[PDB]
Amino acid sequence: PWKKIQQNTFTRWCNEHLKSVNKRIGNLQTDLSDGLRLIALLEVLSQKRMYRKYHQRPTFRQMQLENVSVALEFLDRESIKLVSIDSKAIVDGNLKLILGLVWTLILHYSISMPVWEKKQTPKQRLLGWIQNKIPYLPITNFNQNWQDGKALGALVDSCAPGLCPDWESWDPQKPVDNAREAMQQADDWLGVPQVITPEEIIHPDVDEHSVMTYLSQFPKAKLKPGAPLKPKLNPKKARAYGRGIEPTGNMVKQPAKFTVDTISAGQGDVMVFVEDPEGNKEEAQVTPDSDKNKTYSVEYLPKVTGLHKVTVLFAGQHISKSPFEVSV
Structure with missing residues (x-):
């Protein structure tokens, strides 16, 4: 067996x-x-x-x-x-x-x-490299840890965020389907051949050597161009609109308001700061428009005339088309 x-x-x-x-x-x-x-x-x-x-x-x-x-x-x-x-x-x-x-x-x-990117055995070396890729799961072995197929999902997505973006949400009671999805994605877009099969790798009698043989291919893995990456976190899916970030119109000493949509950007919080013509950087007031926080209302008050730079961040990263240049 x-x-x-x-x-x-x-x-x-x-x-x-x-x-x-x-x-x-x-x-x-x-x-x-x-x-x-x-x-x-x-x-x-x-x-x-x-x-x-x-x-x-x-x-x-x-x-x-x-x-x-x-x-x-x-x-x-x-x-x-x-x-x-x-x-x-x-x-x-x-x-x-x-x-x-x-x-x-x-x-x-x-x-x-x-060579990959101590007094260690090859097994320990591989285990360490894998664990470094799957930080949110305790990877201490090459058998039981891989049984529910989710660890594979985590590994693949970590090598190329967007291949298995929802791995953490996968049903653990569907091990074969999970492993197949992860391994086929790795095969198609990371060039990792399925030297072991999904059915085999989750089998209870699976041997550590068979598993190590498969996983040993990931350190050399390379992403193929054109891969359909749909990363869980995507700041560039977030978008801003409204008078407040339009190049002209906003009046000096009048509240400037706009909206930020993050419904497709995934998990994260919105942060906005405005740089006035003098270099002063002030943080704008950000407020969710509902309980579901799909959109955020943003407000600031331009106090001088000239070019203002509005930086809009989602998860600490510029959203689409940020920073916005706003003339007052």
Whole structure:
């Protein structure tokens, strides 16, 4: 069960790399046996070519042993220690050991070696990077924390705010739907392949290794252009209108009033300050027009003639077209 999901995930991980050289693994237990796909995988990961020649068409066990020998020799030279792995283990399809070999490659190339943006183990390093992205959830493991699918939503939206903006509101009783939504968005717009499936990652018997294999891809993730980002917080969705922010009309020593709409701007408070021609900055009176605070009435009193600059902020950030130039 934990090993079934692991086999699938490790297989998909191998395939994402092999795709670059037009190869693929159907069954991990058998398809590394002749050494050809193993060699190819190692070349992609290490970005080096095999220095020793090998059999291009191994048709019997002896030739397969000799091919794997080259691969294992290469691994020893790269200083990638292997846990109880000999040539026959691979050729004769010892699944538990073959899984160990793949994990060794995942751990080294996907988690340990890469540079991301202490005396730490790779696992601790990844856990720390993930936790830094998901500040509002206690991320202490690679199993139970991901079961309701919301953590995935948080991670993806954090990498590109607007992909899963409402993750915190997702129904926790719909784990598969949540995970699918988050993982498909990451796939489409962050380039993170679903080396594990939504159904697998939330499975109770899921293994930490399978989960780590998937999440290890996020540090390298990059946002594709044209991504349909609809961030929860969007100050630029907030808009101001009314005489008070129109370039002309406002009379000196007469109340200047306008409105601020924040219905689509998300969560935050409105703050407005006015700079007069002298440089004096005064805070304007802001008042909600109702219990739902969808709009705000703003009022200030221009006291001298000349150019006034009205800064309107939502969540501490300029709204659309702020600051507004107002001549008195």
